[PDB]
Motif scaffolding. Structure first.
Motif, mmCIF file in Angstrom:
data_model
loop_
_atom_site.group_PDB
_atom_site.id
_atom_site.type_symbol
_atom_site.label_atom_id
_atom_site.label_comp_id
_atom_site.label_asym_id
_atom_site.label_seq_id
_atom_site.Cartn_x
_atom_site.Cartn_y
_atom_site.Cartn_z
ATOM 1 N N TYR A 1 0.833 -1.197 0.000
ATOM 2 C CA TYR A 1 0.000 0.000 0.000
ATOM 3 C C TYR A 1 0.871 1.252 0.000
ATOM 4 O O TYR A 1 0.597 2.213 -0.720
ATOM 5 N N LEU A 2 1.936 1.220 0.794
ATOM 6 C CA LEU A 2 2.854 2.346 0.896
ATOM 7 C C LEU A 2 3.491 2.572 -0.462
ATOM 8 O O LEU A 2 3.692 3.708 -0.892
ATOM 9 N N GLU A 3 3.801 1.470 -1.133
ATOM 10 C CA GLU A 3 4.387 1.516 -2.462
ATOM 11 C C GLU A 3 3.475 2.177 -3.500
ATOM 12 O O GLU A 3 3.961 2.956 -4.320
ATOM 13 N N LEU A 4 2.171 1.890 -3.480
ATOM 14 C CA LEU A 4 1.292 2.553 -4.466
ATOM 15 C C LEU A 4 1.249 4.086 -4.286
ATOM 16 O O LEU A 4 1.327 4.858 -5.241
ATOM 17 N N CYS A 5 1.130 4.475 -3.024
ATOM 18 C CA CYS A 5 1.307 5.792 -2.447
ATOM 19 C C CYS A 5 2.464 6.527 -3.091
ATOM 20 O O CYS A 5 2.403 7.738 -3.309
ATOM 21 N N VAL A 6 3.508 5.785 -3.438
ATOM 22 C CA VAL A 6 4.664 6.386 -4.082
ATOM 23 C C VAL A 6 4.336 6.848 -5.493
ATOM 24 O O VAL A 6 4.705 7.952 -5.893
ATOM 25 N N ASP A 7 3.641 6.002 -6.246
ATOM 26 C CA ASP A 7 3.252 6.353 -7.607
ATOM 27 C C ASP A 7 2.376 7.595 -7.656
ATOM 28 O O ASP A 7 2.542 8.448 -8.531
ATOM 29 N N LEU A 8 1.449 7.691 -6.711
ATOM 30 C CA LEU A 8 0.551 8.836 -6.632
ATOM 31 C C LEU A 8 1.167 10.031 -5.909
ATOM 32 O O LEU A 8 0.528 11.076 -5.786
ATOM 33 N N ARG A 9 2.400 9.872 -5.427
ATOM 34 C CA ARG A 9 3.089 10.935 -4.694
ATOM 35 C C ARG A 9 2.256 11.468 -3.537
ATOM 36 O O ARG A 9 2.299 12.656 -3.238
ATOM 37 N N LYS A 10 1.480 10.582 -2.917
ATOM 38 C CA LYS A 10 0.641 10.940 -1.777
ATOM 39 C C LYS A 10 1.413 10.837 -0.457
ATOM 40 O O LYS A 10 1.104 10.014 0.401
ATOM 41 N N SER A 11 2.403 11.705 -0.297
ATOM 42 C CA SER A 11 3.275 11.656 0.858
ATOM 43 C C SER A 11 2.588 11.776 2.206
ATOM 44 O O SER A 11 2.964 11.086 3.157
ATOM 45 N N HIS A 12 1.588 12.646 2.298
ATOM 46 C CA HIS A 12 0.899 12.854 3.562
ATOM 47 C C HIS A 12 0.256 11.567 4.030
ATOM 48 O O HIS A 12 0.460 11.144 5.170
ATOM 49 N N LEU A 13 -0.502 10.936 3.136
ATOM 50 C CA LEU A 13 -1.177 9.680 3.445
ATOM 51 C C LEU A 13 -0.186 8.580 3.801
ATOM 52 O O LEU A 13 -0.436 7.768 4.689
ATOM 53 N N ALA A 14 0.937 8.557 3.092
ATOM 54 C CA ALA A 14 2.010 7.613 3.365
ATOM 55 C C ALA A 14 2.575 7.748 4.777
ATOM 56 O O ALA A 14 2.745 6.744 5.470
ATOM 57 N N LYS A 15 2.894 8.974 5.195
ATOM 58 C CA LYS A 15 3.436 9.194 6.539
ATOM 59 C C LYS A 15 2.413 8.727 7.558
ATOM 60 O O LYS A 15 2.745 8.031 8.517
ATOM 61 N N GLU A 16 1.154 9.091 7.326
ATOM 62 C CA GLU A 16 0.104 8.721 8.256
ATOM 63 C C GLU A 16 -0.111 7.215 8.275
ATOM 64 O O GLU A 16 -0.345 6.637 9.334
ATOM 65 N N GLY A 17 -0.024 6.582 7.108
ATOM 66 C CA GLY A 17 -0.154 5.140 7.023
ATOM 67 C C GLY A 17 0.902 4.453 7.865
ATOM 68 O O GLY A 17 0.587 3.632 8.728
ATOM 69 N N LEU A 18 2.160 4.809 7.625
ATOM 70 C CA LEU A 18 3.278 4.227 8.351
ATOM 71 C C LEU A 18 3.216 4.467 9.859
ATOM 72 O O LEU A 18 3.351 3.519 10.634
ATOM 73 N N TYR A 19 3.011 5.716 10.276
ATOM 74 C CA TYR A 19 2.936 6.024 11.709
ATOM 75 C C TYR A 19 1.795 5.274 12.379
ATOM 76 O O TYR A 19 1.975 4.643 13.420
ATOM 77 N N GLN A 20 0.623 5.338 11.764
ATOM 78 C CA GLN A 20 -0.557 4.716 12.337
ATOM 79 C C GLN A 20 -0.392 3.195 12.384
ATOM 80 O O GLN A 20 -0.816 2.548 13.344
ATOM 81 N N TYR A 21 0.238 2.630 11.356
ATOM 82 C CA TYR A 21 0.508 1.199 11.344
ATOM 83 C C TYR A 21 1.503 0.853 12.445
ATOM 84 O O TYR A 21 1.320 -0.125 13.165
ATOM 85 N N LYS A 22 2.541 1.670 12.596
ATOM 86 C CA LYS A 22 3.545 1.427 13.632
ATOM 87 C C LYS A 22 2.937 1.455 15.042
ATOM 88 O O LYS A 22 3.261 0.604 15.866
ATOM 89 N N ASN A 23 2.053 2.419 15.310
ATOM 90 C CA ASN A 23 1.427 2.530 16.628
ATOM 91 C C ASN A 23 0.618 1.281 16.961
ATOM 92 O O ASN A 23 0.508 0.899 18.127
ATOM 93 N N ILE A 24 0.070 0.640 15.933
ATOM 94 C CA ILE A 24 -0.767 -0.539 16.126
ATOM 95 C C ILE A 24 0.047 -1.793 16.317
ATOM 96 O O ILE A 24 -0.348 -2.698 17.047
ATOM 97 N N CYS A 25 1.166 -1.881 15.604
ATOM 98 C CA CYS A 25 1.918 -3.130 15.492
ATOM 99 C C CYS A 25 2.988 -3.386 16.556
ATOM 100 O O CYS A 25 3.604 -4.451 16.567
ATOM 101 N N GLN A 26 3.154 -2.486 17.508
ATOM 102 C CA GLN A 26 4.302 -2.591 18.390
ATOM 103 C C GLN A 26 4.242 -3.966 19.034
ATOM 104 O O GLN A 26 5.268 -4.566 19.357
ATOM 105 N N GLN A 27 3.024 -4.452 19.224
ATOM 106 C CA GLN A 27 2.763 -5.686 19.966
ATOM 107 C C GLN A 27 3.458 -6.925 19.408
ATOM 108 O O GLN A 27 4.005 -7.735 20.157
#
Length: 137
Positions: free
Chosen positions: A51-77
């Motif tokens: 998903y992050l990779e598609l984000c690259v094609d669309l140059r949707k940096s904001h959504l990408a940062k939010e995707g990664l951060y939000q995913y990281k907050n969830i996955c620490q477990q």
């Protein structure tokens, strides 16, 4: 309905085949930032990386940062390294888009790249388990 989890990605490809690329990206964002994710296996992190990779094609940096951060907050477990792996993935993707645009030629693409490096650095900052990956970026 997460498992089998071969459906989110398929539907993304389906949504892109109809040319609704942004809808497809936003759809994957929903999946990887879902609350059920922490319970879910590190493997989905593979899907998150795509998903992050598609984000690259669309140059949707904001959504990408939010995707990664939000995913990281969830996955620490569990599947914690996964964060470092999708970090690495993101960097390698943008780092290849630079290769493409440079070899074919563009400023925005440099700025996109910078902004990406920056975001990954602020994501991996100060984490014992992410130190090697952070040092690399």
């Amino acid at each position: 309905y997460f498992q089998r989890p071969e459906n989110a990605l398929k539907r993304a490809n389906e949504f892109l085949e109809v040319g609704k690329k942004q809808p497809a990206l936003d759809v994957l964002y929903d999946v990887m930032k879902s609350k059920k994710h922490r319970t879910w296996q590190k493997i989905h992190e593979p899907i998150m990386l795509k998903y992050l990779e598609l984000c690259v094609d669309l140059r949707k940096s904001h959504l990408a940062k939010e995707g990664l951060y939000q995913y990281k907050n969830i996955c620490q477990q569990v599947n914690i390294k996964s964060l470092e792996d999708v970090v690495r993935a993101y960097l390698k993707m943008a780092e290849e888009k630079t290769e493409a645009a440079k070899e074919e030629s563009l400023t925005p693409w440099v700025k996109f790249l910078w902004e990406s490096y920056r975001q990954c650095l602020d994501l991996l900052r100060n984490n014992s388990r992410v130190e090697r990956l952070y040092h690399d970026i």
